[PDB]
Amino acid sequence: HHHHHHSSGHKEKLHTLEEFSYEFFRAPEKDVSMAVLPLARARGHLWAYSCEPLRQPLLKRVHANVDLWDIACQIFVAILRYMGDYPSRQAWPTLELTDQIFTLALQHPALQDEVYCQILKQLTHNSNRHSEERGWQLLWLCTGLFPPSKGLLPHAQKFIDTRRGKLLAPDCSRRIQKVLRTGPRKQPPHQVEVEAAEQNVSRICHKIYFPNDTSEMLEVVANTRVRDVCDSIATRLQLASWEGCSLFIKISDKVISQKEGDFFFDSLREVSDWVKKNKPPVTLPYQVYFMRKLWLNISPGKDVNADTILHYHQELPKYLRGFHKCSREDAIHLAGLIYKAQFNNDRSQLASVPKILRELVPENLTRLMSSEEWKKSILLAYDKHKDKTVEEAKVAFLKWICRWPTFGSAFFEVKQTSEPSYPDVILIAINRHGVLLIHPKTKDLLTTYPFTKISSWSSGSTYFHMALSRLLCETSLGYKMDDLLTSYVQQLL
């Protein structure tokens, strides 16, 4: 009957775990005594608020396993510390408390009811308004991670239903409904989740960055999946489709892609834990980016919004690094389009702005003409776009380069030791055609390894290898290559 909303018309007695305890809680410790030993006071109910730490698990099923006793007791202390009912001279960071409360319960589903019972116990006959407020914050965190069992659920629902007047109570009840639909979380609450709980705020917005130097605030809940955020981003930006687009975490010297069917807050913690371990207590700053990952079946003009927000600002810095094989004539034609996309009608910035040529011409082709020469040729190419919009210019830029073999690729400047036929330092490109090998001086295609022909690939922190002929690369970017190759290979319908 959790699928039901119950009513009587009036306020019912506040529901406790007293009746539940009689069957599922273990025997309460009643009272050999010595007059020298201290009294050891506060002999209240086991199912009601106690400022005294536990010594045995509350539940029979957790008490029946001696290995679970230590975890149960450590959970209760972190519960006490969190709620401000413990002598805490040592001010523990709230995340160390919340990790200690929920981490092992995600691992051992026996502890899941134990966590619920300990929070509900602490919310029963609690005369402290600070502690009660904090207790509701933990229950709120809990309902977003795992639900109570079949036997516990009716009691937990009635506990919330008889206290509907509590600020976070309607949300706790709604959250139990959601975690039953979408399943439990893999990670304990995140920094963001915990900071919103602490402020008694039940709505979270996370900032997402776009390649066009913009950002949006996206609404996220405990059960939000990485794909759900993309669906929201695609509605926001008005993209026809986000197929081939993914979210990325820019953290440390890494740009790590997020798995679509992973919970957003699970994905955040998993990546940070990976990064934290691969670097040798303070939290790691990060940015969340939405970008195109796989450039398969991209047709400029079909989705103008994706073209002007994503594709242009993604292709632009690659072209400027001079990764493509292009002429002085292509550079003049494209620099006029790049000028129009950025300055629109302001014609004077080409003379005014110093080092502007860096923003308009590939770094390799810069030496072909003098400063005044590029300026003269670019103005003439630009004047041809007076009746175009900034958006038209961005789509024209793309239409002209979209058929290029190196268009929509990820570039890696590795050190190869495999074939002495090729130069020492080489440029690798992963795109729709496969793994492309390019000469850095003359941008000629050395070889193309299609996906159908690749057998295996491995990467460490110091390298990347491939097999068919065997390719050896010395790079720190191995993780991104490994990931992009696996992702491209995995595209099968």
Numbering used by the authors: 1 to 10, 1605 to 1625, 1627 to 1875, 1881 to 2068, 2075 to 2099
How is this structure described in the published paper?
Myo7 is a crucial component of the tripartite complex that maintains the necessary mechanical tension across the cadherin links. The results presented here reveal nearly identical interactions between members of the Myo7/harmonin-a/SANS:ANKS4B tripartite complexes that link cadherins to the actin-rich core in stereocilia and microvilli.
The basis of the harmonin-a PDZ3c/Myo7b MF2 interaction was determined by solving the crystal structures of Myo7b MF2 and of PDZ3c/Myo7b MF2 complex at 2.44 and 1.88 Å resolution, respectively. The MF2 domain adopts a canonical MyTH4-FERM supramodule, with limited flexibility between the MyTH4 and FERM domains; while the FERM domain consists of three globular subdomains or ‘lobes’, similar to previously described MF structures. This limited conformational pliability upon cargo binding indicates that the groove of a particular FERM domain defines its cargo recognition. The five linkers in the FERM lobes dictate the orientation of each lobe and thus define the shape and, as a result, the specificity of the central groove.
